[PDB]
């Protein structure tokens, strides 16, 4: 979508990389994570993540929370295709439903729970 990663890598490059990684690690899903525009929240030093399929969204929330150094009180919301995924879903289910044509799963994050 509005991701910076797609403006620095063309589709053919992303799709080729995504297909290989899905072959090199069939039990992992490649995830691109970027801050949503207009969001007031800390930045993420790295945006490309290789995540085990059985990790839940709630466990990825916490992992991302630490990388941004968010307190447990501070709000954090994920958006996949403008929808907030359930915390009880796994990253494997989320990837299988929502992966784009380059075989990447795209997640935006924000301090706001409303699209946005």
């Amino acid at each position: 979508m509005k991701f910076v990663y797609k403006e620095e890598h063309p589709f053919e490059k992303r799709r080729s990389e995504g297909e290989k990684i899905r072959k090199k690690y069939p039990d992992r899903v490649p995830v691109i994570v970027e801050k949503a525009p207009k969001a007031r929240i800390g930045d993420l030093d790295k945006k490309k993540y290789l995540v085990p399929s059985d990790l839940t969204v709630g466990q990825f929330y916490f992992l991302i929370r630490k990388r941004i150094h968010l307190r447990a009180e501070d709000a954090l919301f994920f958006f996949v295709n403008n929808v907030i995924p359930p915390t009880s879903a796994t990253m494997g289910q989320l990837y299988q439903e929502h992966h784009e044509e380059d075989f990447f799963l795209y997640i935006a994050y924000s301090d706001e729970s409303v699209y946005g």
């Binding site: 990684i21 490309k48 993540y49 290789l50 466990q59």
Partner: peptide, 11 residues
């Protein structure tokens, strides 16, 4: 850049 692989810790 490079990929960040994640490893879940055991309870």
């Amino acid at each position: 850049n490079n990929w960040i692989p994640v490893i879940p810790p055991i309870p």
